[PDB]
Symmetry: C2
Subunit: 150 residues, 2 copies
Amino acid sequence: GAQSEVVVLYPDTENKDLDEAVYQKIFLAGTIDMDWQKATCDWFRALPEGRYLLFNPRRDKGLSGEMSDFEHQVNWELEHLEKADLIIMNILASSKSPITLLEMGLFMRSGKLRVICEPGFYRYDNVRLTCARYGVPLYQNMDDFLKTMR
Amino acid sequence: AQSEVVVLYPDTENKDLDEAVYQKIFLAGTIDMGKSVDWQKATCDWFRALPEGRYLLFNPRRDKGLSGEMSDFEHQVNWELEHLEKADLIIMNILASSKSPITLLEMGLFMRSGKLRVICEPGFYRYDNVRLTCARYGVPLYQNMDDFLKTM
Ligand SMILES: [Cl-]
Ligand SMILES: [Cl-]
């Protein structure tokens, strides 16, 4: 059965007195549709081993639109993209994902970025050509990528 | 007393030119294939009006739009990424009306380079993301080209 330990961190949740050093820290970057993020968390929960700390920027309820809340969201995203051991970036064909592409550029040369970009995405060839140039692993679906991790 | 300005496009070649003796500037940002919003030409003309200097401007905006043929498109992206890397300075101008998704990819790519200058017009649909990210990584952010070009 499932034996992995999975802790999920959200921008609007706090897990005080947790040692982030003993976990594999994974940032779930990509399309926010108000939910591949929950299915990815469930996938890690189903694993037979490991300690995972997943940084999920997708809140259960959408943003209010209030400025200080928005700044908290962007700063939470950038701080946890930096803290992550691995960035799982999933881009759906239906999305425009403009800030996902900003984040992709930011962590393109980090060595910890894994891009999953669905064919049909309106800027797919840009993503393919840029990842090729900088040697970033590029997958077409989450099944192919998540097999590379058991 | 006039400046020397050479403009290099994805569909042009200046093979008898030593790029090492020029200040290389990449014109990143909004590409509008309308006669009115050609800010890249106006920027090139601004450099041409200077009384001194040697400037090599990498302009990714072609006079005619892309055909949509795949090898032509790949040439465009590879030309952009190569000349973004070669540039001494990246002038990135983002107009309020634009969606500029590849401009934001390029901004992320050269965010920590120290050679990126961002001009982002208020009203741009992802302005606060640009403002907050530039603030975090210490990238100069301007609201218009006039304010930025005075700092040259
Ligand atoms: Cl959200
Ligand atoms: Cl073009």
